[PDB]
């Protein structure tokens, strides 16, 4: 029994379910109030929102771990440790795999939340060096994966263009066995093209900024952003970002996580090769594509020990499958460019996988022993830019899928509780993520499927024919919009040509179709793979094991859309086979300032995260509920009957207390084990009454003390009054 409650000394509303009235203005004001009082954590039921303070708060001490450990969720004020205590105990006591999902805009705050969880777990499991070795590897390899997987977009200077899973694994005894990192959804298309105002992945800028002249000469790289098609000079500088210094930080992290100097160097040779591939151009011949200038190709092939004659032929001729008389298909110019790009972006994504695999080696469980895990899943935040392209579509689709299963589960669990307590369900109106997901992922008439079909069909294909196909097939959908599709005289700005709009849980998103076709083309065919496998360069050879003649060739996926869709399924499987918790991260400003709070930005993020819908689905019919006994205990000083030691059963006491406070019987309902209160007004009326009564109880004690003090002294004087009255009077005499 503990009487501590999140309600005690609560700054603003500690659990957003108790916000009243519920709207964006009250939500944002609440988050601003708490943030202004150094409270960065706020709940939505069990869900933790985290606003980044941009300064070190002394709230992650061993003492703070001792406070939250083995304690009930509602007993202490909002903190991430409450969530991690919850997840650790479920792992320890139920032997349940845990997955803590972290959504929202990327940055130092999301990384830190993940580090906080892993470090709480390491601290609390009491396994010492074995668990900290795994934890260190996960944590120190972060700047490495950032360099290769993060990029500056128009909205975020350090944005993750991939999803990352990390865990610490244990045997059922609680002994640490190892750990793992899993990457998903790497945005390969950024390797070969970037929107205006955006960069390619960090590592390219870090390399050309921080490498010595001698290193760049060995990489056959020129120190000039304008020399590489895959990088623009225009957006090359990120303010407050020193790519040279970051280069050194990434190289050092590499060493820390166990990369040898030759390996590190090998990695940079692959980055150089990726960069140089982007300078290859093609012209038509009378055999209809030929490389314009063989200089970059030559230097790439010397750098990588790849046969120049073979690689060049791979760009212009594709080996068709047996068994027909024709062996080689001639590639045209457009197809040669797709090949160049497919090679660059797959060489890159495989490098990225190789890095993760390398990091994983030292923490691999290497035992077939059944294990239970503590996992963190970090998914890139929702995106609504001025220009939304393929990249945003995949990201938003992934966020949509997650919100779907989350809202479904929160709804299903609130219902299972209401039933256990014999409480009536009231239908909750909520946005239907399912049909949006269906619009995107349906195999027969979904957007991804139509994009695939367009890319594979033999006719003339453009982003326009793609749009025209969507207009034909997706116009029946309530949530698909385009200029040529619909509509009600409701003040909507007219949709331009060459775009389509989707109603997502986070808001409507307008997608430009420009580049959809190109970015969906991702065919790494056998001739390319075999050219790579034959490289004398050990890392590159290892990156294309399917090119080994000893490995039987399989059918190669020709499009990106289908791979991303399967990758989304993979991470969902990972999540859904585990016990979930949730941290929703929010940036308070874009200046990275310690107290500065922009309600505009927070409002966008509130929408990206789908928090308001979380609040409604979670609050449901009754904002508050509590077991009768602790409820009575907390409020028994309110009516002068329950005070100080009754009434009857805890349930009886609750009823009589509410009757005497003249709380209308429509404001609450009696559960099988808990009182249920509809509106947070009721709860707060009780709380204001208690706070007044505690002032009275203080006076009770204070008056009793002042009283006992004087009474004691008076009794002393009375006891000695004979002596006192004898000393005032003479000794002698007559």
């Amino acid at each position: 029994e503990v009487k501590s409650s999140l309600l005690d000394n609560m700054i603003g509303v500690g659990d957003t379910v108790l916000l009243e009235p519920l709207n964006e203005e009250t939500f944002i004001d609440n988050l601003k109030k708490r943030f202004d009082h150094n409270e960065i954590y706020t709940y939505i039921g069990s869900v933790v929102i985290s606003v980044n303070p941009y300064r070190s708060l002394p709230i992650y001490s061993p003492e703070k771990v001792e406070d939250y450990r083995n304690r009930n969720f509602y007993e202490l004020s909002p903190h991430i440790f409450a969530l991690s205590d919850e997840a650790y105990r479920s792992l320890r006591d139920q032997d349940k795999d845990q997955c803590i999902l972290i959504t929202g805009e990327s940055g130092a705050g999301k990384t830190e939340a993940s580090k906080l969880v892993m470090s709480y777990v390491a601290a609390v499991c009491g396994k010492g060096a074995e668990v900290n070795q795994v934890k260190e590897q996960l944590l120190q390899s972060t700047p490495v994966l950032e360099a290769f997987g993060n990029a500056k977009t128009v909205r975020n200077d350090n944005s993750s263009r991939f999803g990352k899973y990390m865990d610490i694994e244990f045997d059922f005894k609680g002994d640490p066995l190892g750990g793992v990192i899993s990457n998903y959804l790497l945005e390969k298309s950024r390797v070969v093209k970037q929107p205006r105002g955006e960069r390619n992945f960090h590592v390219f800028y870090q390399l050309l900024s921080g490498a010595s002249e001698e290193l760049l000469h060995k990489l056959k790289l020129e120190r000039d952003f304008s020399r590489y098609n895959y990088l623009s000079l225009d957006s090359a500088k990120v303010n407050g970002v020193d790519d040279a210094a970051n280069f050194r930080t990434v190289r050092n992290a590499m060493q820390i996580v166990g990369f040898s100097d030759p390996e590190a160097e090998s990695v940079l040779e692959v980055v150089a090769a990726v960069l140089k591939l982007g300078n290859i151009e093609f012209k038509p011949e009378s055999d209809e594509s030929k490389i314009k200038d063989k200089n970059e190709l030559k230097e790439i092939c010397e750098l990588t020990s790849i046969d120049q004659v073979v690689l060049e032929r791979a760009f212009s001729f594709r080996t068709v499958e047996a068994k027909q008389e024709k062996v080689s298909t001639t590639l045209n110019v457009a197809q040669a460019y797709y090949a160049r790009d497919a090679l660059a972006k797959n060489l890159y994504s495989r490098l990225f996988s190789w890095l993760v695999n390398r990091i994983n080696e030292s923490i691999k469980a290497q035992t077939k022993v059944r294990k239970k895990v503590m996992g963190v899943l970090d998914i890139y935040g929702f995106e609504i830019f001025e220009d939304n392209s393929f990249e945003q579509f995949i990201i938003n689709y992934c966020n949509e899928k997650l919100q779907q299963i989350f809202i479904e589960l929160t709804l299903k669990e609130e219902q299972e509780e209401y039933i256990r307590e014999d409480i009536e369900w009231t239908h909750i109106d909520y946005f239907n993520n399912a049909i949006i997901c269906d619009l995107i992922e349906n195999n027969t008439n979904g957007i991804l499927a139509m994009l695939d079909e367009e890319c594979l069909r033999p006719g003339t294909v453009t982003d326009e024919t793609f749009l025209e196909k969507l207009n034909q097939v997706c116009a029946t959908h309530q949530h698909f919009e385009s200029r040529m599709s619909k509509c009600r005289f409701l003040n909507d700005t007219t949709l331009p040509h060459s775009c389509f709009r989707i109603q997502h849980y986070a808001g409507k998103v307008l997608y430009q179709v420009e580049g959809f076709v190109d970015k969906n083309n991702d065919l790494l065919y056998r001739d390319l793979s075999q050219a790579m496998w034959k490289a004398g360069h050990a890392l590159i050879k290892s990156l294309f094991p399917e090119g080994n003649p000893a490995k039987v060739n399989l059918k190669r996926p020709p499009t990106a859309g289908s791979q991303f869709k399967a990758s989304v399924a993979t991470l969902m499987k990972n999540l859904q086979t585990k016990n979930p918790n949730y941290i929703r991260c929010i940036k308070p400003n874009d200046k990275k300032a310690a107290h500065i709070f922009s309600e505009s930005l927070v409002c966008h993020q509130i929408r990206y995260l789908g928090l308001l819908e979380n609040v409604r689905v979670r609050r449901a019919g009754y904002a508050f509920r509590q077991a009768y006994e602790p409820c009575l205990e907390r409020y028994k000083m309110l009516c002068k009957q329950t005070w100080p030691h009754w009434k009857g059963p805890a349930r009886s006491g609750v009823e009589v207390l509410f009757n005497e406070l003249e709380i209308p019987v429509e404001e609450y309902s009696f559960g099988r084990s808990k009182i249920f209160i509809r509106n947070p007004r009721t709860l707060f009326q009780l709380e204001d009454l208690r706070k007044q009564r505690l002032e009275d109880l203080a006076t009770l004690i204070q008056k009793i003390y002042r009283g006992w003090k004087c009474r004691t002294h008076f009794l002393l004087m009375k006891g000695l009054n004979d002596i006192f009255e004898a000393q005032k009077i003479e000794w002698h005499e007559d």
Partner: protein, 147 residues
């Protein structure tokens, strides 16, 4: 008036013990002290009320029959041992029947008609029998209500 003859004499004895001048009156500032010496436990607010009624002529003094009027008000009132006990238990976040001098200092110095610093200082010492392992309020209240 409802006071019994024995009560009147008992209150008279205390009234005179704080009648320094022998003029048969006591000061308004001594009112609470005399009331508390006689085993009544008035708040500072209630005290202010009684003074407001008798010092509405601006003298700052109280004589015995108006003192008896004052004593008569709270005569039928009583606060149980359990009330004072449960009032303590409310500021205790454990069910141990113990409370920290730091926490006790907090409640006394911040809530209600606040105890002064010297008063809250003095309270701890009487309350800390097993000094200075913090106060078992069950025992402290037991002693406080001891009649």
């Amino acid at each position: 008036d409802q006071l019994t003859e024995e009560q009147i004499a008992e209150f008279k004895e205390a009234f005179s013990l704080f009648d320094k001048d022998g003029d048969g009156t006591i000061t308004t500032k001594e009112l609470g002290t005399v009331m508390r010496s006689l085993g009544q436990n008035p708040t500072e607010a209630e005290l202010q009320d009684m003074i407001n009624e008798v010092d509405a002529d601006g003298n700052g003094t109280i004589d015995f029959p108006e003192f008896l009027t004052m004593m008569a008000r709270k005569m039928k009132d009583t606060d149980s041992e359990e009330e004072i006990r449960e009032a303590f238990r409310v500021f205790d976040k454990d069910g141990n029947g113990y409370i920290s001098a730091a926490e006790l200092r907090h409640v006394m110095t911040n809530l209600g008609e606040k105890l002064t610093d010297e008063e809250v200082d003095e309270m701890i010492r009487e309350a800390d029998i097993d000094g200075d392992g913090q106060v078992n309020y069950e025992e402290f209240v037991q002693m406080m209500t001891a009649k």
